[PDB]
Amino acid sequence: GNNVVVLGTQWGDEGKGKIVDLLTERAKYVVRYQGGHNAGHTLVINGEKTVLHLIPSGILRENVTSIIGNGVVLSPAALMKEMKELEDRGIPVRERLLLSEACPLILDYHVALDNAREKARGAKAIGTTGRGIGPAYEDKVARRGLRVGDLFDKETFAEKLKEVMEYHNFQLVNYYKAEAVDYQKVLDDTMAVADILTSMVVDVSDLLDQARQRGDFVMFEGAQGTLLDIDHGTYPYVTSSNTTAGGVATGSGLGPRYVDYVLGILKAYSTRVGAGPFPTELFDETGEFLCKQGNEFGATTGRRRRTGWLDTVAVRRAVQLNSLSGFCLTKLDVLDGLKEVKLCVAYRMPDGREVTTTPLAADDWKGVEPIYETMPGWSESTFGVKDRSGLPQAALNYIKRIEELTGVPIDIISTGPDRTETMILRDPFDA
Amino acid sequence: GNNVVVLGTQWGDEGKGKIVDLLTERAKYVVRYQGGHNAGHTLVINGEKTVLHLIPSGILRENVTSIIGNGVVLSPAALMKEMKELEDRGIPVRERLLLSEACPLILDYHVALDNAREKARGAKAIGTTGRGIGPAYEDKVARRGLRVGDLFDKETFAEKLKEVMEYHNFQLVNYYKAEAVDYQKVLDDTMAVADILTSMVVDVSDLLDQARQRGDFVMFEGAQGTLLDIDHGTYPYVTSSNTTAGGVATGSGLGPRYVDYVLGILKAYSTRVGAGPFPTELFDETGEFLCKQGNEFGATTGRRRRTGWLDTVAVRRAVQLNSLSGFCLTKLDVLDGLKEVKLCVAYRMPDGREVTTTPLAADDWKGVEPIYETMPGWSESTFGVKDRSGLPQAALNYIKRIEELTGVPIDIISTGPDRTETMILRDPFDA
Ligand SMILES: Nc1nc2c(ncn2[C@@H]2O[C@H](COP(=O)(O)OP(=O)(O)O)[C@@H](O)[C@H]2O)c(=O)[nH]1
Ligand SMILES: Nc1nc2c(ncn2[C@@H]2O[C@H](COP(=O)(O)OP(=O)(O)O)[C@@H](O)[C@H]2O)c(=O)[nH]1
Ligand SMILES: O=P(O)(O)OC[C@H]1O[C@@H](n2cnc3c(OP(=O)(O)O)ncnc32)[C@H](O)[C@@H]1O
Ligand SMILES: O=P(O)(O)OC[C@H]1O[C@@H](n2cnc3c(OP(=O)(O)O)ncnc32)[C@H](O)[C@@H]1O
Ligand SMILES: O=CN(O)CC(=O)O
Ligand SMILES: O=CN(O)CC(=O)O
Ligand SMILES: [Mg+2]
Ligand SMILES: [Mg+2]
């Protein structure tokens, strides 16, 4: 399919940055359509590591045009910080990156508010990444936020910037008894970068309509994961954007009917960073082994990630929400050596019922229990394996089992961090 | 196609409630996926008028199951008010209506805030419908809002309700120097209706996944119109939800790939209620004639609607944003008698350029001018006409012209308020 979507089927960090970089060798565009710099996408090329946050993952490929679509809440400070770092490394970001004039802007008061609210919640804090994501969306939705378009006229921008900060500053000093955010530092920092930021603007929806018609290959790069979806996630322990496939259109302007293939990034074991329900969570040698073996540490905040077994019930909700076409099994090399592995196949509900669909809101997951199928692990190494033949039967069986339980083929398998330690059984672009 | 979407291609009020009711004769479900009770959908059956706001438009058809999906911000007060009215008229709402536990709740403080903010803006007020839509979305996105799910445990709901109102009450009395909203009246009014509201809950995304697989016919009913889309609309003179086709999935849980046909409701002349750019706006006998002949008055606030010529440039943006399959021409009978009619074919940009794509943010539409094609009107009456043969050539030519300029067939034509005063040239469900 020409229009390929690559998103996280779990709670983020499944390995989307790596697969996006891999698959784009044939792409004209890579588009980010939600989240902001809360995302941490690790790319490893010949052992050279790269972590992207706001810049899309096709930025290393000279042939790809990277696009930050309207759904992304854009932090000028973060954009600029990352642009400089990548430029120093011989990556001409300004030449490859384009951005939507409809993207809301994340500014410092957004971080003050995020922080503020996060303190206010006390023990019931969301565990947000401390970037100002939430607040920037609230503002968006509220129709008081600023967007890349507002920079088109500096005078009015200061006018508009002055009101909003005034507004947010009253709440911060008077309500959270917080320190105020300086209107003048924000105006200055921004104006320092406007012209560069402004030069990368393009009518993204019109560009994609044109790309669609030329039959160009387009790749949409998700951020976060299905269960963090503001609507369908474990509310309120979620992110503020729709991380599910439906956010592709709203977040870029491409008619929903132009989504040809939806690749679900599936990790092989589960992880979460932030608070929130997590049925298959492991608090023992084995989960400890998972974190350690998979080096599960937040690529954005550095926080240690919670690990658990693969939850096929949770995953089955992603299949339906995202109309998955196929899965990409990531980090199988991490399950290497375990005597046995297991899959959550159903949930024991606190009232006694055995169920196979997941609760919606966080509160409703409260006392849910997992029913697991236990399978043989494997001692042979699968690390770097580029062929299934190189995969031990137990691995193949596990693979087969995930397919059986979900009804979606696993079209790609990832056996390591490096771009090339992958098996493409079926390339989404082909069909 | 089994999954049919019916949305507004302009600024709302194109005639969606009527077409939804018409087309559902063959549907199993009708799903609302965004907006709340800001919508005003008029149905006319044998001359009996019905105006829906929050209840979907398939509620009059005994065979259809009406669903309020997660994207809709749900007002218990409005639901209950409308349920009672429809019940008194022999319509057993509780038997036909289902709703998502993931829908945020609109409560009185949401109206106080909407009002508050609307006053704060002064002359630059959005012209919001005075229902608490904006605030309920802000809360949603902020992760502090309440949802149908929170009513599942009354104790914690009061706990949760108490914090939020406290929060909103500080801002209202201290910042807007507004009157506070009484926590106890809100808790009581709500608890009075919880049990009824609660009984209509169902896992909407799972239901649609199951419906999809059974091949059942599903109709998604949009609210508002394309140019009011929070992202792609004339920001900030927009509504707070994505009114574009991409909001179907995020707002219901159906994978985006299951959208088979997207019907664009197209009015034949343009209207807007609320502030915001409007290039083809008419301030003369003819616009006056349009309002009067089309009885263009807000079906929700009663406000007079602004009228203008059909804007093919604006419409062409809806075609791409929504991946339209076909159009439904509505209110052609209203253009009857005019000596001549006209279509905006391009925009003269304030810097001299002739352009055919629309600006994004409101500020950018500021000095845009329309280039029109002027066409022969017609004296013959098209009112109630059920066949094209009954349409005069000038009408047919106009029709043909809209197709030529947009590239999308007009699959249905509406010649009046009543369900039956319509021509279905191509039924979306068939293909
Ligand atoms: N061992 C192993 N590490 C992988 C594999 N695929 C990706 N990684 C690493 O696993 C982590 C994925 O985390 P992150 O980069 O935050 O995920 P993203 O947000 O989905 O891009 C990164 O450290 C990747 O380098 C794999 O197949 N095996
Ligand atoms: N004259 C005429 N009125 C129509 C036609 N179709 C619908 N209407 C009326 O036009 C108005 C459409 O407004 P509204 O109900 O708010 O639109 P909706 O929000 O799209 O459902 C209503 O008063 C309808 O009764 C038509 O073909 N001709
Ligand atoms: O307001 P927010 O900052 O968005 O936080 C809300 C919640 O969502 C989590 N979170 C945010 N970004 C995440 C990410 O990005 P990638 O997978 O794209 O690398 N991966 C995993 N979890 C992520 C936070 O940990 C928190 O629980
Ligand atoms: O916060 P809001 O109350 O949503 O207002 C924001 C803006 O959007 C407009 N508006 C809201 N609902 C509308 C509607 O519903 P239907 O077409 O479905 O019948 N039709 C037309 N315009 C509508 C308001 O007039 C205002 O400019
Ligand atoms: O890659 C994303 N992270 O794991 C999220 C974070 O750092 O919190
Ligand atoms: O039918 C919807 N209206 O025209 C909106 C309003 O009443 O403001
Ligand atoms: Mg990550
Ligand atoms: Mg209406």
Side-chain angles (χ1 to χ4, degrees):
Chain A
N2 291 326
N3 295 140
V4 181
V5 178
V6 165
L7 67 223
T9 62
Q10 298 151 317
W11 292 278
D13 308 330
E14 305 76 7
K16 306 170 302 293
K18 170 190 161 172
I19 302 284
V20 166
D21 169 79
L22 176 64
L23 297 170
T24 46
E25 177 180 271
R26 303 179 52 194
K28 210 303 182 59
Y29 307 94
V30 180
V31 194
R32 264 287 298 283
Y33 53 86
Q34 48 68 53
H37 61 296
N38 40 358
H41 301 176
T42 312
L43 276 51
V44 169
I45 293 79
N46 283 10
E48 188 187 14
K49 185 192 274 205
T50 289
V51 175
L52 300 172
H53 298 285
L54 170 70
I55 282 76
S57 298
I59 202 75
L60 302 193
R61 317 202 72 138
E62 117 86 3
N63 67 115
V64 170
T65 295
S66 285
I67 315 183
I68 290 174
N70 68 277
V72 184
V73 287
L74 203 164
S75 171
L79 170 65
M80 296 304 162
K81 168 167 181 310
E82 300 182 61
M83 298 194 23
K84 194 269 186 293
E85 292 167 348
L86 302 173
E87 295 192 324
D88 287 341
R89 302 170 61 215
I91 304 161
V93 179
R94 301 149 209 227
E95 315 184 337
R96 311 184 177 179
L97 186 68
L98 292 180
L99 58 93
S100 183
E101 73 198 90
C103 299
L105 297 175
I106 295 178
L107 305 164
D108 266 291
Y109 51 94
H110 288 135
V111 184
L113 309 153
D114 196 347
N115 290 174
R117 318 217 215 266
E118 199 62 331
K119 227 154 295 127
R121 299 190 57 109
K124 292 179 147 305
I126 289 159
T128 75
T129 64
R131 311 313 199 259
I133 317 298
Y137 274 116
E138 300 164 25
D139 278 19
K140 156 179 168 160
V141 128
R143 303 102 123 197
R144 79 179 131 246
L146 273 46
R147 315 197 308 175
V148 170
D150 291 309
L151 301 170
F152 296 163
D153 169 317
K154 295 175 179 139
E155 278 209 59
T156 59
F157 179 82
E159 299 191 7
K160 292 164 174 167
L161 185 64
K162 191 168 188 57
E163 320 199 34
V164 68
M165 293 197 75
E166 232 145 47
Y167 171 67
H168 294 125
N169 268 327
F170 182 113
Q171 54 170 317
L172 277 164
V173 343
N174 295 310
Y175 187 81
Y176 298 118
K177 305 313 192 296
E179 65 282 41
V181 176
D182 188 54
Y183 163 80
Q184 191 65 55
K185 179 173 165 45
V186 186
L187 176 48
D188 295 335
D189 292 0
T190 306
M191 293 296 124
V193 304
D195 292 357
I196 292 165
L197 181 14
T198 277
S199 62
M200 305 177 274
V201 162
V202 71
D203 185 324
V204 175
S205 66
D206 197 71
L207 177 167
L208 294 183
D209 184 36
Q210 300 180 301
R212 193 262 301 175
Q213 294 186 221
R214 295 192 295 254
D216 298 332
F217 283 10
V218 179
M219 179 147 290
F220 296 87
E221 176 190 359
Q224 290 79 65
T226 287
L227 292 195
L228 289 179
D229 185 280
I230 187 50
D231 274 280
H232 310 279
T234 60
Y235 186 89
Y237 299 107
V238 296
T239 193
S240 309
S241 60
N242 292 109
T243 56
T244 41
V248 171
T250 73
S252 58
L254 185 54
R257 284 195 300 110
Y258 302 137
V259 186
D260 313 329
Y261 185 112
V262 188
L263 226 217
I265 304 313
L266 187 69
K267 187 187 288 174
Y269 60 92
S270 307
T271 76
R272 250 204 107 129
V273 222
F278 190 178
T280 61
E281 195 177 19
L282 291 175
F283 314 77
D284 58 353
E285 318 75 36
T286 158
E288 129 203 348
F289 162 86
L290 280 184
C291 180
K292 161 181 54 236
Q293 287 303 303
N295 184 225
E296 292 304 350
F297 281 85
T300 287
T301 60
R303 289 177 303 175
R304 175 187 199 306
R305 297 188 184 122
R306 305 154 68 185
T307 44
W309 298 113
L310 184 34
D311 184 342
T312 295
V313 179
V315 175
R316 258 135 66 196
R317 179 70 81 160
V319 177
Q320 51 183 220
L321 293 185
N322 306 299
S323 47
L324 290 174
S325 294
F327 287 119
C328 170
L329 188 58
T330 73
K331 313 188 106 187
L332 161 64
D333 59 286
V334 173
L335 297 193
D336 287 7
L338 288 170
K339 242 88 257 71
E340 51 180 27
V341 298
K342 60 184 84 164
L343 299 174
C344 179
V345 295
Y347 286 171
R348 177 63 57 199
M349 287 314 288
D351 66 351
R353 321 176 332 272
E354 174 170 39
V355 144
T356 42
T357 60
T358 68
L360 288 260
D363 274 16
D364 306 300
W365 289 73
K366 179 40 201 61
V368 174
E369 288 291 338
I371 311 333
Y372 296 114
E373 280 182 12
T374 306
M375 292 204 258
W378 50 88
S379 70
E380 302 93 321
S381 198
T382 62
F383 184 84
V385 172
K386 263 64 97 176
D387 268 287
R388 298 183 46 205
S389 328
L391 299 186
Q393 198 63 216
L396 289 189
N397 290 177
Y398 180 72
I399 296 169
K400 179 64 221 156
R401 197 59 186 134
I402 302 171
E403 298 177 332
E404 277 161 13
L405 291 162
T406 62
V408 175
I410 282 175
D411 283 359
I412 302 181
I413 302 152
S414 179
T415 65
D418 204 277
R419 177 194 261 172
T420 75
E421 310 172 312
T422 311
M423 276 159 251
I424 287 45
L425 319 185
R426 176 164 62 121
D427 182 328
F429 280 129
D430 299 327
Chain B
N2 291 326
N3 295 140
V4 181
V5 178
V6 165
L7 67 223
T9 62
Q10 298 151 317
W11 292 278
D13 308 330
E14 305 76 7
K16 306 170 302 293
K18 170 190 161 172
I19 302 284
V20 166
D21 169 79
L22 176 64
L23 297 170
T24 46
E25 177 180 271
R26 303 179 52 194
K28 210 303 182 59
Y29 307 94
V30 180
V31 194
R32 264 287 298 283
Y33 53 86
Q34 48 68 53
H37 61 296
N38 40 358
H41 301 176
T42 312
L43 276 51
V44 169
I45 293 79
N46 283 10
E48 188 187 14
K49 185 192 274 205
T50 289
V51 175
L52 300 172
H53 298 285
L54 170 70
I55 282 76
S57 298
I59 202 75
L60 302 193
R61 317 202 72 138
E62 117 86 3
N63 67 115
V64 170
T65 295
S66 285
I67 315 183
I68 290 174
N70 68 277
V72 184
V73 287
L74 203 164
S75 171
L79 170 65
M80 296 304 162
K81 168 167 181 310
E82 300 182 61
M83 298 194 23
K84 194 269 186 293
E85 292 167 348
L86 302 173
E87 295 192 324
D88 287 341
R89 302 170 61 215
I91 304 161
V93 179
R94 301 149 209 227
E95 315 184 337
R96 311 184 177 179
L97 186 68
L98 292 180
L99 58 93
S100 183
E101 73 198 90
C103 299
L105 297 175
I106 295 178
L107 305 164
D108 266 291
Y109 51 94
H110 288 135
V111 184
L113 309 153
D114 196 347
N115 290 174
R117 318 217 215 266
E118 199 62 331
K119 227 154 295 127
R121 299 190 57 109
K124 292 179 147 305
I126 289 159
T128 75
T129 64
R131 311 313 199 259
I133 317 298
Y137 274 116
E138 300 164 25
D139 278 19
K140 156 179 168 160
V141 128
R143 303 102 123 197
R144 79 179 131 246
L146 273 46
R147 315 197 308 175
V148 170
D150 291 309
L151 301 170
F152 296 163
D153 169 317
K154 295 175 179 139
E155 278 209 59
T156 59
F157 179 82
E159 299 191 7
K160 292 164 174 167
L161 185 64
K162 191 168 188 57
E163 320 199 34
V164 68
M165 293 197 75
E166 232 145 47
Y167 171 67
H168 294 125
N169 268 327
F170 182 113
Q171 54 170 317
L172 277 164
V173 343
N174 295 310
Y175 187 81
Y176 298 118
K177 304 313 192 296
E179 65 282 41
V181 176
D182 188 54
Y183 163 80
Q184 191 65 55
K185 179 173 165 45
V186 186
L187 176 48
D188 295 335
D189 292 0
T190 306
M191 293 296 124
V193 304
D195 292 357
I196 292 165
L197 181 14
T198 277
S199 62
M200 305 177 274
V201 162
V202 71
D203 185 324
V204 175
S205 66
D206 197 71
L207 177 167
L208 294 183
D209 184 36
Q210 300 180 301
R212 193 262 301 175
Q213 294 186 221
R214 295 192 295 254
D216 298 332
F217 283 10
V218 179
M219 179 147 290
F220 296 87
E221 176 190 359
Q224 290 79 65
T226 287
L227 292 195
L228 289 179
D229 185 280
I230 187 50
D231 274 280
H232 310 279
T234 60
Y235 186 89
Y237 299 107
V238 296
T239 193
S240 309
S241 60
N242 292 109
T243 56
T244 41
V248 171
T250 73
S252 58
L254 185 54
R257 284 195 300 110
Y258 302 137
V259 186
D260 313 329
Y261 185 112
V262 188
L263 226 217
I265 304 313
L266 187 69
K267 187 187 288 174
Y269 60 92
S270 307
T271 76
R272 250 204 107 129
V273 222
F278 190 178
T280 61
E281 195 177 19
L282 291 175
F283 314 77
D284 58 353
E285 318 75 36
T286 158
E288 129 203 348
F289 162 86
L290 280 184
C291 180
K292 161 181 54 236
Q293 287 303 303
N295 184 225
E296 292 304 350
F297 281 85
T300 287
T301 60
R303 289 177 303 175
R304 175 187 199 306
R305 297 188 184 122
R306 305 154 68 185
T307 44
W309 298 113
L310 184 34
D311 184 342
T312 295
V313 179
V315 175
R316 258 135 66 196
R317 179 70 81 160
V319 177
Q320 51 183 220
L321 293 185
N322 306 299
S323 47
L324 290 174
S325 294
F327 287 119
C328 170
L329 188 58
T330 73
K331 313 188 106 187
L332 161 64
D333 59 286
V334 173
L335 297 193
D336 287 7
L338 288 170
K339 242 88 257 71
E340 51 180 27
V341 298
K342 60 184 84 164
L343 299 174
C344 179
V345 295
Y347 286 171
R348 177 63 57 199
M349 287 314 288
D351 66 351
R353 321 176 332 272
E354 174 170 39
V355 144
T356 42
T357 60
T358 68
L360 288 260
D363 274 16
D364 306 300
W365 289 73
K366 179 40 201 61
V368 174
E369 288 291 338
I371 311 333
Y372 296 114
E373 280 182 12
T374 306
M375 292 204 258
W378 50 88
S379 70
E380 302 93 321
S381 198
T382 62
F383 184 84
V385 172
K386 263 64 97 176
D387 268 287
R388 298 183 46 205
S389 328
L391 299 186
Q393 198 63 216
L396 289 189
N397 290 177
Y398 180 72
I399 296 169
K400 179 64 221 156
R401 197 59 186 134
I402 302 171
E403 298 177 332
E404 277 161 13
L405 291 162
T406 62
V408 175
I410 282 175
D411 283 359
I412 302 181
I413 302 152
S414 179
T415 65
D418 204 277
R419 177 194 261 172
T420 75
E421 310 172 312
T422 311
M423 276 159 251
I424 287 45
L425 319 185
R426 176 164 62 121
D427 182 328
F429 280 129
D430 299 327

